[PDB]
Design a protein that fits this description.
By secondary structure, the protein is mainly β. It folds into two domains: 5-174, Acid Proteases (Cathepsin D, subunit A, domain 1, Beta Barrel); 175-330, Acid Proteases (Cathepsin D, subunit A, domain 1), CATH 2.40.70. The protein contains four helices and 24 strands. It has helices at 114-117, 144-148, 229-236, 307-310, and strands at residues 3-9, 17-23, 28-35, 41-43, 68-78, 84-96, 99-112, 124-127, 156-160, 167-171, 184-187, 196-204, 210-218, 225-227, 243-245, 250-254, 262-266, 269-273, 279-282, 289-292, 294-296, 303-305, 314-318, 324-328. Strand 6 (84-96) and strand 7 (99-112) form a beta hairpin. The protein is globular. Disulfide bonds join 255-290.
Length: 330
């Protein structure tokens, strides 16, 4: 089997991407944030504290003939940005782009933090990291990908995120028309439960490539590119007037600037992030200070190849017995 679904930016800055997901019988379609940095499929629901729902579409398990309470199971998750959610668990039928999993754990939110409430466009998350990170207790649950894997034509999914435009998540096949050149594959460590890999270096603009190992995670659920302070300083030093602002919470730059590209290494291959992808616009409405898309990972504890980086590539998440990651230009 295979699946193919379009993923769409939630706003003009590509702050996140939503992908329609069918849950239950008859189908209830919710727009979920596919997150390769976590492993819980959770949704706004009929059980969510009413004051914490503001425009989201909710899953109502009582209206699904295939929903079953997973008795005794609860979940609770905290994300890197400080947001959180928790609740109980149903199993139900879940389909993405024509690919159906029966018996999928659907985590129903009883509580969500303010950032979720305040984002009316995201109805929940669909985790695509390794199932060892799943938070369901006392019986840990499998991700949608893990449940689908055996049935897939090939045990892979791909992320093809757009810049200010829709893109695609495919399951079970590699669309050879979706990228240019060849795909370069690189080793993955699953020790922390992430799609963790080591980049071979970077370049700023038309500058020379610096060979250096950068361990980080491929994370579709993180907006920006978070790298070591040395790398980030070297980038922003090439933008007149750019500076790190503690009051704003990272590097800002004059909105009048033209940003240089940023290249990262994947083995001997190179992925180029155009300068425009690194512009996240005015810090506040009407400001001439703009927020940067490359930020320091210092104090996160991990480097994160988030959407800014991933949307410059066609990315293969290979879930074979020994997982790997593939990157191609597009």
């Amino acid at each position: 089997s295979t699946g193919s679904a379009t993923t769409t930016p939630i706003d003009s800055l590509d702050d996140a991407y939503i992908t329609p997901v069918q849950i239950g019988t008859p189908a209830q379609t919710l727009n979920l944030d596919f997150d390769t940095g976590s492993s819980d499929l959770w949704v706004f629901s009929s059980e969510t504290t009413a004051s914490e729902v503001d425009g989201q579409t909710i899953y109502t398990p009582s209206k699904s003939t295939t929903a079953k309470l997973l008795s005794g199971a609860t979940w609770s998750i905290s994300y890197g940005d400080g947001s959180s959610s928790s609740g109980d668990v149903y199993t139900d039928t879940v389909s993405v782009g024509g690919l159906t999993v029966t018996g999928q754990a659907v985590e129903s939110a009883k509580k969500v933090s303010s950032s979720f409430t305040e984002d009316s466009t995201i109805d929940g998350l669909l985790g695509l990291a390794f199932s060892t990170l799943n938070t369901v207790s006392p019986t840990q649950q499998k991700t949608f990908f893990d449940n689908a894997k055996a049935s897939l034509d090939s045990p892979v999914f791909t992320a093809d995120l757009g810049y200010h435009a829709p893109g695609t998540y495919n399951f079970g096949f590699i669309d050879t028309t979706a990228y240019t050149g060849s795909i370069t594959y690189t080793a993955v460590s699953t020790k922390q439960g992430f799609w963790e890999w080591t980049s071979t270096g970077y370049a700023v603009g038309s500058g020379t490539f610096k060979s250096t190992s950068i361990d980080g995670i491929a994370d579709t659920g993180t907006t920006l590119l978070y790298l070591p302070a040395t790398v980030v300083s070297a980038y922003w030093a090439q933008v007149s007037g750019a500076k790190s602002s503690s009051s704003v919470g990272g590097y800002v730059f004059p909105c009048s600037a033209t940003l240089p590209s940023f290249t990262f290494g994947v083995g001997s291959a190179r992925i180029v992030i155009p300068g425009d992808y690194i512009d996240f616009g005015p810090i506040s409405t009407g400001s001439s200070s703009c927020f940067g898309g490359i930020q320091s990972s210092a104090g996160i504890g991990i480097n994160i190849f988030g959407d800014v980086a991933l949307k410059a590539a066609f990315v293969v998440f290979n879930g074979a017995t020994t997982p790997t990651l593939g990157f191609a230009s597009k």
